[PDB]
Design a protein around this nucleic acid. Structure first.
Ligand SMILES: *OP(=O)(O)OP(=O)(O)OC[C@H]1O[C@@H](N2CN(C)c3c2[nH]c(N(C)C)nc3=O)[C@H](O)[C@@H]1O
Lengths: 429, 205, 126
RNA sequence: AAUACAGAGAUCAGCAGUUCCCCUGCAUAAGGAUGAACCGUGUU
RNA sequence: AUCCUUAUGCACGGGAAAUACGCAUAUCAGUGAGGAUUCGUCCGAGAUUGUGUUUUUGCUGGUU
């Protein structure tokens, strides 16, 4: 009787088939052992009975044992930067005081009728707008366009990362082009005062301070900024005028001086990329949007993380501050715009415009008038107009054949300039 | 080892003639027709049996699938649609089925009866795409139908009625528990309806 | 993982990779796929491609970094997936594969999976 | 070496099994297409 | 709910081939095997090297 059973037992199929019945039977139970045993949890096509067999086949070959045996700091330093914080406080505090006073003064007049006429007029104006021309720039999509404080000149950055400055009204052709040392352009910004300088961030982790010379095409590097490893997505000038803050990919937004070209603050706190930095009009606060879907406010003067905003279930590309200074607006991969006003805090918080399909790139408030309208751009090819009171969508405009990387709007609000995957720059009325 | 029957030959109406296995070959000619012809069908019957038995087993197995309970997705794809009229019942019915058919969470609303309205749907991204296809390309909202009233049947011309999508996107959580078609008389309780869901904004004037 | 290569961009996540690699293989069986660098580079020059998939951890990475600059001129989406070994399997190959280009046939059976994934990928290129 | 011997030494036939290939079923995976008149926050 | 497509698994029925089918504590190989060209370019996965069986593998039945 022994020799009969032994030869049967010695056999590989039989040896397997005995082992198959001692292993539990559920999809989950089977699966867990696999991942623990490191082999692929699932294969191409299989029913669980086929899955179960694989276990056995793996358990057999290695002669492995049964599932039984199977199973915050404060950082010191940089006194010199410390000096600046004082400057900010003196500048910030005064500015805030002035702003609040001005806001209050508006309140007194009331006379609702005028206002409610005004909004209607604005909406009608928005409804009308159309293309003026297109134009061209390069053969890579256009990553950033910006208007000077006098609104006479546009700068256009390609992915190729070469910037040509164009003439607002006509656009035709341009003043003069430069192919900068960098290949993929993040953002381009004007100094608020002189109209003599720009700043541009790009793939190489180097920010370049440009001197724009008169009507000359002799755009001249004033200095380069170093310290950044990864690509730099966004860069801005403090509302003040002295300081430039940089925000890139390695979880470091860096506050920089214009004059000395020094690193005033190295800040941390997001856990993935940080795709935008915005500075808020009293020059008190910077809000950082990130790829981790956490909008995080920051007080420059104390260097304290203040209020974390959670609302975006995909990366937050643009963070647009409002002129009034008590509201912010964000946009993201999720096709939402959140608008958070810090004053309410306990129960007002975020009003979500549902704006766009297919992402959002750059949200812009209207500069003059304290901020009323919103303008935003996604890959939906459309472009939107929003009230800042109801946040009802008012109108949309389609002149682009492709997606839109970024857009900036005339200070008066008689221009809208939008630039596009399609490689043109389209002036909107 | 002798645990198992020694196999007998397969036989067919081709192989039939030259198998001289001891069983009534030339002797009983029609008795050997039946054996092979019966034999052939018994093999086939087995093919049919393996099929039906397997077919039946899966349906029981299916019930375990029925029992399995969702396991939340981390992100919820969503859509939103907006139309002039929903009056046609055939349209009212499909929207109830497919929503229950595909496990789409969500809601629908509108103004009174003839007043326009909105649709909301949420699920895994595969589900929405089906439903989106339905609402736009399959169903004709401009089509005409003869409705039934309490008295009798009357024509309706919906040609002016039209549909278009507003947004598709992504949301931290979908507070919609089930898909609940309803009616609101005003534009306000309509908001308060969505208001319960913190969805007031999804309506566009 | 290992340090994902900084030049790797757009980098697909876990959930997109499953959706992409599945399309790859689904095309392999209709022989609408093309595997490898040169085979992929050929496609763009001709003008038949739909999108390129690349290996992120391709060692060294500089050997495929030309594809991105070619894709941007032909207006063709692209992404990196996190390992080459996985991409090797999906193309039906024993051995590591660093790039692959799905192609065009507009009578195809799988046409609607492809437009799905390009729509997802072009989102990553911000 | 002499001798004793014993002294020149199976064929006809069937079925399954490996290998590709087509037809037809059921399953498992992904994918699609189209149809279903109704709308869950004081007498026992 | 029907219907349709591709892949994989078990399977009835029908064919073709075994100078064919494999194997290796072994060399390379889409980070390009091996070919075609109208000379402009075009296809894109196996090639070496040692080895096992190959007028046959297992299994029954008749007749002497
Ligand atoms: O076959 P059975 O009735 O058992 O199906 P289930 O009871 O398992 O239940 C819900 C599923 O039914 C399928 N149906 C059923 N019908 C009538 C139907 C389904 N699906 C569609 N589409 C999604 C197009 N249209 C229909 O008319 C669905 O799979 C449901 O999940």
């Amino acid at each position: 009787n022994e020799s009969t059973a032994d030869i049967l037992k010695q056999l590989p199929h039989e040896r397997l088939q005995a082992v198959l019945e001692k292993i539990p039977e559920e999809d989950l139970e089977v699966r867990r052992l696999l991942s623990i045993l490191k082999k692929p949890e699932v294969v191409e096509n299989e029913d669980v009975q086929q899955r179960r067999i694989r276990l056995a086949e793996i358990l057999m070959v290695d002669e492995i044992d049964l599932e039984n045996i199977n199973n915050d700091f404060f950082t010191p330093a940089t006194s010199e930067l410390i000096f600046a914080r004082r400057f900010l406080i003196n500048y910030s505090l005064e500015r805030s005081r002035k702003r609040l006073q001005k806001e209050m003064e508006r309140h007194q007049k009331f006379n609702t009728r005028q206002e409610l006429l005004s909004r209607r007029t604005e909406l009608q104006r928005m409804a009308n707008l159309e293309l003026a021309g297109s134009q061209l720039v390069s053969t890579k999509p256009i990553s950033a366009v910006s208007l000077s404080t006098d609104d006479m000149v546009v700068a256009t950055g390609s992915w190729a990362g070469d910037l040509q400055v164009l003439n607002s009204q006509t656009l035709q052709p341009l003043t003069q082009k430069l192919d900068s040392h960098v290949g993929k352009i993040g953002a381009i910004d004007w100094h608020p005062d002189s109209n003599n300088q720009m700043i541009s961030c790009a793939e190489d982790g180097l920010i370049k301070n440009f001197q724009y010379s008169n009507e000359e095409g002799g755009l001249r590097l004033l200095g380069d900024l170093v310290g950044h490893e990864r690509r730099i997505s966004d860069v801005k000038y403090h509302p003040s005028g002295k300081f430039i803050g940089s925000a890139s990919h390695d979880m470091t937004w860096r506050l920089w001086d214009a004059s000395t070209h020094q690193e005033l603050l190295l800040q941390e706190g997001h856990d993935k990329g940080v795709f935008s930095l915005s500075f808020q009009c009293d020059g008190s606060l910077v809000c950082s949007g990130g790829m981790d879907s956490l909008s995080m406010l920051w007080d420059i003067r104390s260097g304290s993380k203040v209020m974390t905003l959670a609302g975006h279930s995909k990366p937050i590309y643009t963070v647009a501050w409002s002129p009034n200074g008590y509201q912010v607006a964000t946009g993201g991969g999720d096709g939402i715009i959140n608008v958070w006003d810090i004053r309410k805090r306990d129960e007002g918080q975020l009003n979500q415009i549902l704006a766009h399909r297919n992402i959002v790139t750059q949200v812009r408030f209207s500069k003059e008038d304290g901020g009323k309208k919103l303008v935003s751009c996604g890959y939906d090819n459309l472009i939107n107009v929003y009230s800042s009171d109801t946040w009802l969508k008012m109108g949309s405009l389609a002149g682009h054949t492709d997606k839109i990387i970024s857009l900036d709007i005339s200070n008066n609000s008689h221009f809208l300039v939008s630039g596009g995957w399609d490689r043109s720059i389209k002036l909107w009325n | 080892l002798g645990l198992l029957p020694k196999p007998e030959p397969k036989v067919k109406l081709s192989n039939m003639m030259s198998v001289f296995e001891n069983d009534q070959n030339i002797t009983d000619p029609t008795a050997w027709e039946k054996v092979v012809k019966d034999q052939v069908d018994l093999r086939k019957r087995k093919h049919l049996e393996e099929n039906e038995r397997r077919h039946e087993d899966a349906i029981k197995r299916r019930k375990e699938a029925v029992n399995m309970n969702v396991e939340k997705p981390t992100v919820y794809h969503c859509k939103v649609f907006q139309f002039k009229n929903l009056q046609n019942p055939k349209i009212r019915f499909k929207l109830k089925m497919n929503s229950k058919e595909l496990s789409l969470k969500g809601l629908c609303l509108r103004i009174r009866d003839d007043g326009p309205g909105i649709i909301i749907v949420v699920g895994n991204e595969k589900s929405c795409k089906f439903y989106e296809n339905l609402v736009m390309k399959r169903i004709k909202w401009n089509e005409d139908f003869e409705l039934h009233t309490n008295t009798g049947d009357i024509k309706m011309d919906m040609h002016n009625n039209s549909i278009s999508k507003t947004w598709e996107g992504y949301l931290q959580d979908c507070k919609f528990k089930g898909w609940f078609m309803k009616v609101c008389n005003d534009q306000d309780s309509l908001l308060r309806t969505l208001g319960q869901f913190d969805s007031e904004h999804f309506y566009s004037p | 993982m290992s340090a994902p290569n900084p030049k790797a961009f757009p980098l697909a996540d876990a959930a997109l990779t499953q959706q992409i690699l599945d399309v790859v293989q689904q095309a392999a069986n209709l022989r609408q796929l093309k595997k490898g660098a040169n085979e992929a580079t050929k496609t763009l020059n001709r003008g038949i491609s739909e999108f390129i998939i690349m290996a992120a951890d391709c060692e060294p990475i500089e050997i495929l970094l030309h594809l991105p600059l070619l894709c941007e001129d032909k207006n063709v989406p692209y992404v990196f997936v996190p390992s080459r070994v996985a991409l090797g399997r999906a193309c039906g190959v024993s051995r590591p594969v660093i790039a692959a280009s799905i192609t065009t046939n507009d009578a195809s059976a799988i046409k609607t999976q492809i437009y799905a994934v390009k729509d997802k990928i072009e989102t990553l290129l911000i």
